[PDB]
């Protein structure tokens, strides 16, 4: 559920990082492209981002219609203060 994924999100973001390469080229587009940076530091919002594409990549395949939906999903979610 919501909580859960947020927290796995976080988690990851600070443990993981951007240490798997597929979500870091997917996050370097985002950032520049569909993710403002202006509330967190460039690091801090990469490693979170890569951190959603870690999480969906665990459930779905890389650039696979639901990989889609679950990546747009978290970096949509007005509550992610780093993405918004
Ligand atoms: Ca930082």
Do not use: G, Q, W
């Not at 985002?30 to 951190?51: D, Q, V």
């Not at 594409?53 to 990989?67: H, V």
């Amino acid at each position: 559920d919501d909580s859960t994924t947020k927290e796995l999100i976080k988690k990851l973001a600070e443990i993981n990082k951007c240490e798997n390469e597929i979500s870091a080229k997917y996050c370097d587009h985002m950032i520049h492209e569909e993710i403002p940076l202006k509330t967190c530091t460039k690091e801090k919002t990469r490693n979170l981002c890569c951190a959603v594409s870690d999480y969906c990549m665990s459930y779905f395949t890389y650039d696979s219609e639901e990989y889609y939906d679950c990546t747009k999903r978290e970096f949509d979610d007005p509550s992610y203060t780093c993405f918004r």
